[PDB]
Amino acid sequence: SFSESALEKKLSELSNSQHSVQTLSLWLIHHRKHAGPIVSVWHRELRKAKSNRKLTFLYLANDVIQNSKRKGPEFTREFESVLVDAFSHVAREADEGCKKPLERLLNIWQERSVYGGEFIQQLKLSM
């Protein structure tokens, strides 16, 4: 049963494990009908998380964007109007840290072509 305030909770609980990301990402696709609200609160809780978890949020994005595609172009569509902000935001606050994992996520994105060429760019130059 979808509820915005439950998502905020799951997000708060999201760990870095392969299991945490992969079954939270399943919950979200179950509710692909709620893609717009889901992404908008992800964007809010993302910006609230500490820097060590910001990456993990982008890895949630990944697993839902990629697996939602067998189901429809909802989250794919919802996330683009956001990702140029989320990346550019996480680029900073990686002030005293490493942007190599973000530059790889863009590369496994143009490789699998999850988004399109001009948008993988702007994602690259957002940082």
Binding site: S17, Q18, S20, T56, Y59, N62, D63, R112
Partner: peptide, 12 residues
């Protein structure tokens, strides 16, 4: 502790 998420794990 479980294995760490890998961005590639999704099926392509």
């Amino acid at each position: 502790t479980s294995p760490s998420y890998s961005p590639t794990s999704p099926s392509y």
